[PDB]
C-alpha cells in the first residue's frame, strides 16, 4: 500500500482503510481523489 503521510493521516481521521482503495497516482500512489471516490461509494451503502 503506497500513499503520502498526508493521505495516510487523512485515512486515519476518516477511518478509511487504504488497503481497500485503488491508487491512480504516479506509481500506483493513493491520492486525495482516490480516498474521496471510496468515501463517496461507501455513503451509497445506506
Amino acid at each position: 500500500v503506497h500513499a503520502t503521510p498526508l493521505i495516510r493521516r487523512l485515512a486515519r481521521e476518516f477511518g478509511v482503510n487504504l488497503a481497500k482503495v485503488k491508487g491512480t497516482g504516479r506509481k500506483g500512489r493513493i491520492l486525495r481523489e482516490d480516498v474521496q471516490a471510496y468515501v463517496k461509494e461507501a455513503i451509497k451503502r445506506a
Binding site: 503520502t4 503521510p5 498526508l6 493521505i7 493521516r9 497516482g25
Partner: protein
Amino acid sequence: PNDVDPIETRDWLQAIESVIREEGVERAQYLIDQLLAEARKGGVNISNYINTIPVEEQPEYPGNLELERRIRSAIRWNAIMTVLRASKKDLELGGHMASFQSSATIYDVCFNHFFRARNEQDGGDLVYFQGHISPGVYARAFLEGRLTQEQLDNFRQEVHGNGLSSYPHPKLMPEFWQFPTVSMGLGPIGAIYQAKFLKYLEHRGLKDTSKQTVYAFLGDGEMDEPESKGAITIATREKLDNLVFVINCNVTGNGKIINELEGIFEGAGWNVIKVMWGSRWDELLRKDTSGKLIQLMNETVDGDYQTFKSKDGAYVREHFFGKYPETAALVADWTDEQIWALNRGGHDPKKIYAAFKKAQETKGKATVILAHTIKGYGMGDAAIAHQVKKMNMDGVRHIRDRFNVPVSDADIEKLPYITFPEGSEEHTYLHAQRQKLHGYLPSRQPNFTEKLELPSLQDFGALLEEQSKEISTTIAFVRALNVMLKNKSIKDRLVPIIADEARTFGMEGLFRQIGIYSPNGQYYKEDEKGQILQEGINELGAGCSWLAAATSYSTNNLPMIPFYIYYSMFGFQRIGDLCWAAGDQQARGFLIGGTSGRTTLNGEGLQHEDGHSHIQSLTIPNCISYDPAYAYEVAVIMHDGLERMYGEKQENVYYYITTLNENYHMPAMPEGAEEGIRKGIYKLETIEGSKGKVQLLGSGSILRHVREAAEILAKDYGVGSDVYSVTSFTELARDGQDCERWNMLHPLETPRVPYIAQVMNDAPAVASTDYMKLFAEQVRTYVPADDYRVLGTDGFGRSDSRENLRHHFEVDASYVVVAALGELAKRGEIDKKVVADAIAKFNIDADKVNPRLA
C-alpha cells in the same frame, strides 16, 4: 527542467508542518530520527556546522564583559610570565602556554559565573581541569591572593616546599588540587563515575549532592584514548544530568573531529551543544536568506579551517565568501579587517555562557560542550617562544599588544607579574564573583571532620577463633564485611564494589541483606537505596567508582569505605595507571584481589593465574599490600586498615589484600600475634629436631604446604624448624629498606635492626609463595641467615589441578623439603645423598625446563 512530481513533495512538506501544530519541534525530531533509521535499511543518506543555541534562545550575559577581559588578560599574562621565568632558569623545567591560551575564556566564564566552591550544603562543583592549563589556574589563584609571587617563581620547583606542581597532583598540593588529570583518558572516565557516585550518595540518603556538577575539561586529541569514550554510554544509562564534558576543539585530516565527536556522543544518548561561531557571525547568518553561508560552513573541512587562520581578511573574502554570490554579497559592505575579526565560538563569552547555562538546565542525560577554539590564540607566530633566550622579545611584545596588558616596553624584559590592588574595579569584581559562588576553587580538605565509632578487633571475634569447617580467605573477607555492616557508625558508609562475578566471591549473601544499587524503576534488593555497586565486565569503571568512594572523605566531608573485589589478575595489571592516580588523589579504601595466586586459580590458565600483582602493587608508595594465609590474619589486617584510614589517625594510604578461592583448615589466632600480622611476619610454631634446624617461611595458599614440609623434615629427616607466616613480604622489605637508609645516614649511632631480623634467626631459611620468587627474595638483605632459598611461581600460568601446578611451579611441600635438606648438606649437617634420594622419593624432575621458560 526542474524535478519530477511536485504535488507528492507538497504533501510531504505540509505534513511535517501539521506535526509542529500537534506539539512538534520535539515530536517532529522523534519522527525525523525514526524516518532516517528506516531510510538507512533502504539505502539512503549530523546537524549543521553552526551553534546549537541560536541568538533568539541565547540568555543575556550577566557579567561585565569589559571588566572580565581586563581580569582575563592579567591571568593570561601571569600564566605566560610563570612559564617564561621557569624557562629562563635553563633547568629543563617545562610548562605549556598555547593550551591555556585557547581555553582561557572557557574557564573564565566558568570561574565568573558557574564553578561553585566548597560550601555549607555540599563539596561544590568537581572540576577535572586539563593538566596542561595549570599555569592559568595558578595565575588566577595569584590574582585572588591565594598564591605568592615567590610560589609562581618556583613553578615546577617544589622539592624545597616553596613551589608549585607541574599539574593537578593532590598528594603534592593537598589543600589546592583535587583530581589528577595529566594522564589523559583517566579524567573523562573518572568524572563519569564521580558524577555516578554523587547520585549514589543522594539516593542512599547520605548527602544532598543535587546542586553539584562534575566538569571534565578535555582536548580533542585526548578523546583518542579508549578510556575517554569507552564509558560514555554509562552517563546515559545512569541519567547523569550532573555531568558536563567540555571538549576544546582547536586529529582527523580530511574529516571533521567536531562531527565525529557529535556523532558518537549523540549516538551514546548525550545532549550535544556545539559552540562554533562567535557573535560577529550572527549579523551575516541572520541576513542570509539563501542558506548558502550554512552550506559553505558545512562543506569547509577541518584542514581548510586552519588554512584560513594563517592568511588575511582579503583571502577569506575571496576563498570563503567568494565561493558563492549570496555569501559574497553578505560581506560586500565589510572591510578586510572586519572580515578577519570574525570569531570562533570558544572565544566568545556570550556563546560560552549560553552553552553552560543550557547544560545546567538539561535533565535525564549528560551534556557535552564542543567548543571551537584557535590553537595558540593571540600568540601570533610562536604557536617558538624560545626566542626570549635569544632575546627577541617581539613575541612577548605581541601578546602584550594583543590583550592590551598594562606593562611598559621597558618593563617587558623584567617579565613582570600584574596585580589588581585593593579598591580597584578589577580586584572588587574578581573576588565578588567568587564570593557569590561560595569561595575559591580549586581547594581541598585533607581530612574529614566527623568521628566514626569503628568496630573493635574483638567485634570480629569469631574470625580470630578456629574455624569449625574449612573456609577460604575470601569467605573470611565477606564475614569481616558482615561485622562492619553491624556497626551503626560505618554500616551505611561501606561501599562494596563488584566487577560482574559475584557468585565467584560469595557476595550473593550480601545481595539480599544490603541490595544492589540500581537508580532506575524496573529474590533480593535492586533499587535506588541498594548499597552494592555492580559494575559488570568493567574493571576500570569499578576502579573509578572505588576512587570516588575512597576520596569522598575529602570531596564531600563524608567518609565512605569502599571494598572492590575482582579477579586479582585484572587489578594493577589492567587498571595500573588508575591505581597510581588513586595514590595521587590520596585514596583511602580497600582493593581485594580475589581468586589470587598462580597455582590456586588452577583451571583458568595463562591470562588469569596471578603470581605477580604483589610485584606491581609494591611500586605504589601509599598502597599497603598483604597476602594473608588464614582467616584471623584477614580480620586483623582489615581492622587495622579501617583504624589507620578512617580512624582519627587519617592515614593517606590504601590497602591491597589478596584473597583465595581454596578452602583449608583455619586455626585460631596465636595470643599476641596482632603486631606480627600487621608488621608482616610472626613465628607460628617451633618443631623439634635433633639432626638439624631450618627456618620455613610461607604466605597465602602455599603456607599450609610449607607447614606440611616442616612435618616431613621432622618425621622423616629429624630436622627441626621455626615456621613463619609472612602476611606482607613488601611491608617487611620497606621496613628493612627504612632501617638501612637510617643506618647509612647515622654512622655514629647504634644500627637499627629490621623487624624481620628481630623475628627471624641465623638458621638456613626456605621461603615459598604463590607469587614469583622476587616477592619473597625482596627481603634477602634483611634476612639474618647465611642461606635464604626462595621458591616461587615464575613463568606463565596454565590449566591443571592445584597439585599438578604446585609441582610444576616448584612450590609444594616436596620442593620445600629438597630446598631445606640441600642447605644442611652444604653446611655438612647431612649427607649430599640424602638430598639426591629425596628428589627421587618426591618424584622431582631435576632436569625439567625452568617454569619461567616453560
